[PDB]
Short mmCIF file of C-alpha atoms and ligand atoms in Angstrom, two decimals:
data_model
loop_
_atom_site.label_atom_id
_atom_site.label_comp_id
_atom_site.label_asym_id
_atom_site.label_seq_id
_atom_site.Cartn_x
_atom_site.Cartn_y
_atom_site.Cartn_z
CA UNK O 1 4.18 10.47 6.15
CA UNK O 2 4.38 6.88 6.66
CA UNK O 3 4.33 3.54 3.98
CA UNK O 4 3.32 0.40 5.30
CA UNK O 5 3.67 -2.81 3.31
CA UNK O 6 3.64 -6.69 3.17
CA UNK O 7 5.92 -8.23 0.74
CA UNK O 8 6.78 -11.73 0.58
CA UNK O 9 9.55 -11.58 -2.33
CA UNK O 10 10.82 -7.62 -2.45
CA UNK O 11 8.45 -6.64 -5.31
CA UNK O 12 5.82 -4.32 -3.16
CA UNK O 13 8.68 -3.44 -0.67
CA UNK O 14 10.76 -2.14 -4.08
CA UNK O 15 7.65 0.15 -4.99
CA UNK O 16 7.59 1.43 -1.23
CA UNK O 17 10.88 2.40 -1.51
CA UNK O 18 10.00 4.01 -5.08
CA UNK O 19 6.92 5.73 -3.49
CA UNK O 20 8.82 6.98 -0.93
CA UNK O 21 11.67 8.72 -3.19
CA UNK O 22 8.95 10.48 -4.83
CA UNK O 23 7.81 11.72 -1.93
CA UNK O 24 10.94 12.84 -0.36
CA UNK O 25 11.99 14.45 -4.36
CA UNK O 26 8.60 16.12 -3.70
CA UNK O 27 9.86 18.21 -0.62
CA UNK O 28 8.58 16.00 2.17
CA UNK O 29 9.71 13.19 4.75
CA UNK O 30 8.52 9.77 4.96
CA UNK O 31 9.18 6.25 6.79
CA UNK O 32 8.32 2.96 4.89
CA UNK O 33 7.53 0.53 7.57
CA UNK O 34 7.12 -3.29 7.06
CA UNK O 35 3.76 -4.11 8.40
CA UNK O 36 5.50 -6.48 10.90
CA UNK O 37 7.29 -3.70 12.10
CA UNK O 38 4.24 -0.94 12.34
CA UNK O 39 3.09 1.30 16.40
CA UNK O 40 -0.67 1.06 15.56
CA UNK O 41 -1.42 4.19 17.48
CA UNK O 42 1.59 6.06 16.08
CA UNK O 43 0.33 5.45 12.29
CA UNK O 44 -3.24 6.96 13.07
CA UNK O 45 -1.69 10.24 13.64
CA UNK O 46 -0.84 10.24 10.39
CA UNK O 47 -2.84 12.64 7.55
CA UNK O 48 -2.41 9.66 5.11
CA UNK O 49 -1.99 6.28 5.55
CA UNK O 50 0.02 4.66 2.07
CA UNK O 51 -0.72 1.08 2.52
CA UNK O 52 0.60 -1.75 0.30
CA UNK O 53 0.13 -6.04 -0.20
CA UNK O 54 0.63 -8.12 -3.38
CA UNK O 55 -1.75 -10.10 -4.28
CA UNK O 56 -2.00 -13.53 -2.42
CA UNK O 57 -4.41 -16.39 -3.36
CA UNK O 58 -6.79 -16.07 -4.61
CA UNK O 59 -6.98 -12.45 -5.00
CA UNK O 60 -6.77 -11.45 -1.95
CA UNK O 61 -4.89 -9.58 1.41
CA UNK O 62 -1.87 -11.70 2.94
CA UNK O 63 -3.53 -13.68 5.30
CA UNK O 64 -1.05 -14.12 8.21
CA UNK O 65 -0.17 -10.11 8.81
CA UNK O 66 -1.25 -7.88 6.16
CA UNK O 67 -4.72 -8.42 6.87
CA UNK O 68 -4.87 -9.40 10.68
CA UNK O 69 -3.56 -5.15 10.38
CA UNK O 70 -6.12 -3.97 8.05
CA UNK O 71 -8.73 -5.54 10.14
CA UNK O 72 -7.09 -4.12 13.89
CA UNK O 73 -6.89 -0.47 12.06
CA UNK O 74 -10.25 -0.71 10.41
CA UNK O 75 -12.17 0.90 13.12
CA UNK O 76 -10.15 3.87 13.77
CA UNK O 77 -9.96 5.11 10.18
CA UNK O 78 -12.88 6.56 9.02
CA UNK O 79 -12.50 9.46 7.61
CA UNK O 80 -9.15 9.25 6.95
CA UNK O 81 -6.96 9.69 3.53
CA UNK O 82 -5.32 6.46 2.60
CA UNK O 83 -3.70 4.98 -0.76
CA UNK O 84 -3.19 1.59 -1.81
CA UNK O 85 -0.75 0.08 -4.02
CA UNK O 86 0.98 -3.30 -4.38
CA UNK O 87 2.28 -5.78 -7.13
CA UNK O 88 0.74 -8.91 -8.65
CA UNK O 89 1.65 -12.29 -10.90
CA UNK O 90 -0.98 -13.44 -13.16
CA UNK O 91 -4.43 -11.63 -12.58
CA UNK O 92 -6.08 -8.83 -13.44
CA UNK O 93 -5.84 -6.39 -10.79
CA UNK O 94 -9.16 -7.85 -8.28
CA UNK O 95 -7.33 -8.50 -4.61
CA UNK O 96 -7.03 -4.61 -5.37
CA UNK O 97 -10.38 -3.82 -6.47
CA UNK O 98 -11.42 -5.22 -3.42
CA UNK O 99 -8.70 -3.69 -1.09
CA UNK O 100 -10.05 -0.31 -2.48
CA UNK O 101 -13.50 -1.45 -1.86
CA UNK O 102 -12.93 -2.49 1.74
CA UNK O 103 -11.57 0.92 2.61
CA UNK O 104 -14.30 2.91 1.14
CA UNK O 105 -16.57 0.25 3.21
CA UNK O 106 -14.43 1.62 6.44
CA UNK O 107 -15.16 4.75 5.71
CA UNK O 108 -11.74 5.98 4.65
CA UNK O 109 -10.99 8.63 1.68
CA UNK O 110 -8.98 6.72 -1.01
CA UNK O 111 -7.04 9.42 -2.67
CA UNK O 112 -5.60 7.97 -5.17
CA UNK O 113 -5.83 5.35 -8.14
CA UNK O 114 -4.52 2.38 -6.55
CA UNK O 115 -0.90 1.74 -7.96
CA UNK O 116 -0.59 -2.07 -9.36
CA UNK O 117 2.47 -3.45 -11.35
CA UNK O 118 2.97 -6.77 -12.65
CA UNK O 119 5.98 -8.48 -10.76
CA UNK O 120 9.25 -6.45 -10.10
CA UNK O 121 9.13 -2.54 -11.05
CA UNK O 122 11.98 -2.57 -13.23
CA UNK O 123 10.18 -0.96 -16.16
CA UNK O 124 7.40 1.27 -13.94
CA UNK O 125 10.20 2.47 -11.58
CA UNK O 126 9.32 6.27 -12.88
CA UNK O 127 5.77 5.20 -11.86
CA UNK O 128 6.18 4.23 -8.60
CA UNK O 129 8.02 7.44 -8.19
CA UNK O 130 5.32 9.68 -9.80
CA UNK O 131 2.53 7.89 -7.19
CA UNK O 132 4.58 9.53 -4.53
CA UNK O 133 4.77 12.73 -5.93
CA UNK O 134 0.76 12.31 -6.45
CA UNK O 135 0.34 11.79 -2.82
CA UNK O 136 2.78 14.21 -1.69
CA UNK O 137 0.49 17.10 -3.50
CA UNK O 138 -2.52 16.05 -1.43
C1 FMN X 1 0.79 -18.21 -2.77
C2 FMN X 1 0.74 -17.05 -3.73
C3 FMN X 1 -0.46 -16.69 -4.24
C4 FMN X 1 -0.56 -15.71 -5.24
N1 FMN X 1 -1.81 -15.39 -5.70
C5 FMN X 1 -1.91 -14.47 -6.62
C6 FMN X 1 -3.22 -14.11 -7.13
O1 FMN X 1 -4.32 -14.59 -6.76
N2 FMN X 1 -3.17 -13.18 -8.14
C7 FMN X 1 -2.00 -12.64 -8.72
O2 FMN X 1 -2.11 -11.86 -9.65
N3 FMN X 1 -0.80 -12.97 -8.22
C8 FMN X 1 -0.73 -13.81 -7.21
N4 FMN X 1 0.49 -14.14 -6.69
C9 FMN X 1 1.71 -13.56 -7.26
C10 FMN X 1 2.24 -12.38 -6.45
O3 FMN X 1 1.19 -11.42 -6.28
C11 FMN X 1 3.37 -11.73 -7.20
O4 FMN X 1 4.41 -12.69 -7.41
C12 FMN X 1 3.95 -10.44 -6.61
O5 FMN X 1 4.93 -9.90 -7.51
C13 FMN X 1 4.53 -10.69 -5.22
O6 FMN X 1 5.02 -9.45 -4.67
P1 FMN X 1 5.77 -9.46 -3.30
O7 FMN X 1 7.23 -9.89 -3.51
O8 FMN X 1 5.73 -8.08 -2.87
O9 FMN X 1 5.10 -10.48 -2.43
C14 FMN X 1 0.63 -15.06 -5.66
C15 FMN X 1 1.87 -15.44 -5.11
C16 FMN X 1 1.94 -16.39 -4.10
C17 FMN X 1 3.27 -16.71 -3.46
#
């Protein structure tokens, strides 16, 4: 499987790395991949597509490469399983509302409750790792 994220401080890029683990505790392989970093057409091969962004302002995608991404993949996905997480500051969860919203409006499958924590995992470490393991029994 494959993880691509945006992360402009190490908070979403520590729950990739979380995700990942539970996926990999689950049985299974998986690459995280920065979203600078991502082979468009390699990632559409994939079964699901794990995609994650904090939340920028105001409550939305990062604007310089997350998005510029969603928007180059978002005709080639319908149909397909994805699942969204990220982390925020001080709102209430909406850039992800939305996210979820724009992928359903794509066409794609979200199979999972979007994953959103609060700053640095720390305390939903085991969370992040039970995502994974969510994913990895799809
Ligand atoms: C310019 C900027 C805008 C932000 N806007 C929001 C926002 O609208 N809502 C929110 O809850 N957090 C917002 N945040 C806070 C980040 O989502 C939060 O600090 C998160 O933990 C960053 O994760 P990252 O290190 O993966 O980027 C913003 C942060 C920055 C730098």
């Amino acid at each position: 499987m494959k993880i691509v994220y945006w992360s402009g401080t190490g908070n979403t890029e520590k729950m990739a790395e979380l995700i990942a683990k539970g996926i990999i505790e689950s049985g299974k392989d998986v690459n995280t991949i920065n979203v600078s970093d991502v082979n468009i057409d390699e990632l559409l091969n994939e079964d699901i597509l794990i995609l994650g962004c904090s939340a920028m302002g105001d409550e939305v995608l990062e604007e310089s490469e997350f998005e510029p991404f969603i928007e180059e993949i978002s005709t080639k996905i319908s149909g397909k399983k994805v699942a969204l997480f990220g982390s925020y500051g001080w709102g209430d969860g909406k850039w992800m509302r939305d996210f979820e919203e724009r992928m359903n409006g794509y066409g794609c499958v979200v199979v999972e409750t979007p994953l959103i924590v609060q700053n640095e995992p720390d305390e939903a470490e085991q969370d992040c790792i039970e995502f994974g393991k969510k994913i990895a029994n799809i």
